Symmetry: C2
Subunit: 339 residues, 2 copies
């Protein structure tokens, strides 16, 4: 593979040959690509319709250059809870849902970066996001949730300053979690990429629900139905989900909207403290979706899994388990943590 061969193929409106996406991504990650090459390739791969083979290569290479967690520190049953975003932002919902899932006893391992987001809302809550692999492993063990801060794990494409627009590279987070959880609830704002991502997770034998609100939300919505790509036993089933089937009132899109880091942090405290309304509803639904994906690792009938997921999610909040998990998480980071 070479850049001319690859860029020529792209300009010809063709998909890449096997291995070409991997080679290009590896050149970038090792510092061997020039700004022009990075930019042309990033823009081209954002314009062209995505494929599972190419995305799998891109994400696989990105993942291979990440620091892993120390051996045997990630519970076999750990889950991710994340949206891709992409004018959609549900960092509010995803953050709250992650804390609820962890409080329900399912280990959560998230990953990401600051917003200028995910990480900023966590810092606004007092969570210490900037930890090395050993200490993230210790948080997972001791608190039941960990956060893999991108700068610390993926050292390893500042051309994004160069060109000032996001690219496909910014949408691969769910496939590049350094802790490699085998289950998850993955929200995606673009239906074409959601289906592709589902195919990658199937190839990895993950138990994941890839979710897209039929209102465009990158989470399970409460305003209408959602599309779910249910990934289990190496295969994908696409279906429709109606939360009214579990007693959830239809909400309005603007009721679910996030804000800045401080606005988000206030809502997290409201919801964890028991405030009821459209936001809590959406949090419980997405937490339940993650718990359903987790259940999928071990077996599980769909409707009963949902009823159990929703029971566990609601209880995590209503028992105060969630509010207290957050307190323990803040407490952990404030300790004198030694290597």
């Amino acid at each position: 593979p070479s850049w001319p061969q690859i860029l020529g193929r792209l300009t010809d409106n063709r998909d890449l040959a096997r291995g070409q996406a991997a080679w290009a991504m590896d050149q970038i990650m090792t510092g061997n690509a020039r700004p022009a090459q990075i930019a042309a390739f990033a823009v081209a791969m954002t314009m062209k319709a995505p494929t599972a083979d190419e995305v799998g290569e891109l994400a696989g290479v990105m993942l291979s250059h990440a620091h892993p967690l120390p051996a045997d520190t990630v519970p076999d049953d750990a889950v991710d809870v994340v949206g891709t975003g992409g004018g959609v932002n549900t960092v509010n919902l995803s953050t709250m849902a992650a804390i609820v899932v962890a409080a329900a006893g399912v280990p959560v391992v998230k990953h990401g970066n600051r917003a200028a987001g995910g990480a900023d809302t966590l810092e606004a809550l007092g969570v210490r996001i900037d930890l090395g692999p050993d200490l993230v492993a210790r948080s997972l063990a001791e608190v039941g949730i960990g956060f893999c801060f991108a700068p610390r794990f993926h050292p390893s494409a500042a051309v994004r300053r160069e060109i000032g627009v996001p690219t496909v590279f910014n949408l691969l987070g769910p496939l590049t979690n350094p802790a490699r959880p085998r289950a998850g609830l993955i929200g995606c704002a673009f239906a074409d990429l959601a289906e592709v991502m589902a195919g990658v997770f199937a190839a990895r034998r993950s138990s994941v629900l890839v979710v897209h609100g039929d209102d465009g939300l990158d989470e399970l919505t409460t305003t209408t139905t959602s599309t779910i790509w249910r990934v289990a036993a190496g295969s994908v089933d696409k279906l429709t989900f109606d939360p009214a089937g579990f007693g959830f009132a239809r909400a309005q899109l603007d009721q679910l909207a996030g804000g800045d880091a401080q606005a988000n942090a206030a809502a997290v405290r409201a919801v964890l403290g028991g405030a009821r309304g459209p936001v809590r509803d959406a949090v419980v639904l997405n937490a339940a979706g993650a718990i359903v994906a987790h259940a999928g690792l071990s077996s599980a009938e769909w409707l009963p899994a949902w009823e159990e997921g929703l029971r566990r999610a609601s209880a995590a909040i209503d028992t105060g388990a969630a509010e207290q998990l957050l307190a323990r998480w803040v407490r952990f980071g404030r300790q004198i943590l030694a290597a």
Copy 2:
């Protein structure tokens, strides 16, 4: 307009808004673009289906930076004769020969182009192997037009480069739409031409741009992929005149041309091309001569369309007569000799 706005629109799978292509091109040409911005924009604009509005903007900017010829030195009836190449297609042999034949028939020809290693279908090397002096200034191209009947604008002389051009070229290493717009950036601005294009989508788009320019042009694409009127099969012609595009299928068998095989038409290096030019101009019959005549006649037809009273079949008949006679009477061979003498 801004780079983030334009690059974002492109990644969104949208066409650009009016003025945005021109802005971007001019930022590049005035030295206000980072290597990543140049490469992202050029690649994106090569991947997206072209549009006449955008290609018009890009070409108009590029043409605004070109070195013009001196006032009153390009005849009103001058024509271009060019194949764009691209897609592995190279008919520099046919195009070079057709241009000399057209000029020898008495229709002024003004071309621009580069050496083979600096362009998709630059035939400057073939001209040079024939003994023609290719790197002349605007004044001497003007004199060549008047005294020989044909002028050649060497691209590095008439088209300035842009900041980071060398690094971008080296790093991406493939042609972009920046290399495909030659027919619309000819510094002598001839109002007629035969324009061969290897990409039917871009051919149709360029026809639209020429139409809005009030040009009389035959934009052509062989149904075998050739960037010329082919003898292998039918061709699409976008016949442009008085502001409209008449898209038709063309079959040279209607004028008695025998079907050839694509291989029989193949070019080679500059020395192989120069040997073939001498042979064809010396009267050597066969598939190559046929293709040259067909394309020279196409240029003469474009030339005839500068008058609103031109009739298609009679124009073809006359163009085919004039092109054959230019070879047979030795006029083409004589013109080439004179062109060689001129540079000395």
